[PDB]
């Protein structure tokens, strides 16, 4: 289940207490404790799309202690692999247009629509390889497009982890 978050650029000095009031004045839930590490820490949110309001709330858009705080999906590295996550896009724009830059990188075995309350569109996005999915996340992550920068991210892949 995508509902465990990573959360990242974290001062050295950051506290719990400082991630719930920032989850609080959001008026995101979350299901678990914070657990804060070196400059970044982990908490699970009551399912995926509380995890994806945080992301689309808070990642760069919050500070703490002069730190803009960073809030991903958290994802094993041998659990990037296929799947990619876009973000930002573009409310009108047509699914042609968006195929048709998915394709410079690779095979899309599927593109799904995400529900989401932000006036944008979220997809996910599962290539036929990792390679196509590296690239995919290296050339569209920052891309701009119709005054929209997208937002490209990797999302679980497990059922990969050991394709060849």
Same mark, same amino acid.
């Not at 959001?26 to 970044?40: D, E």
């Given at each position: 289940? %995508? !509902? ?8 050295? !000095?950051?506290? @719990? ?15 678990? &404790?914070?657990? *804060? $590490?070196?400059? #970044?820490?982990?908490?699970?949110? @009551? ?20 730190? &803009? ?13 296929? $799947? ?5 896009? &573009? ?15 690779? *095979? *899309? ?17 599962? #290539? ?25 991210? #990797?999302?679980?892949?497990? %059922? ?5």
């Amino acid at each position: 289940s %995508m !509902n465990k978050l990573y959360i990242g650029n974290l001062s050295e !000095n950051a506290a @719990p207490s400082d991630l719930e009031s920032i989850f609080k004045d959001a008026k995101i839930p979350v299901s678990g &404790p914070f657990l *804060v $590490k070196t400059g #970044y820490a982990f908490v699970d949110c @009551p399912d995926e799309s509380w995890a994806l309001k945080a992301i689309e709330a808070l990642s760069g858009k919050i500070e703490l202690h002069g730190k &803009p705080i960073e809030v991903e999906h958290s994802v094993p590295k041998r659990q990037r692999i296929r $799947k990619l996550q876009i973000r930002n896009i &573009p409310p009108h724009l047509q699914w042609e247009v968006l195929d048709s830059l998915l394709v410079q990188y690779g *095979v *899309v075995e599927s593109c799904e629509q995400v529900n989401t309350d932000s006036e944008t569109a979220v997809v996910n996005v599962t #290539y036929s390889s990792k390679d196509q999915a590296r690239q995919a996340l290296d050339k569209l992550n920052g891309f701009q497009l119709e005054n929209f920068t997208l937002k490209v991210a #990797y999302i679980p892949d497990e %059922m990969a982890a050991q394709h060849h």
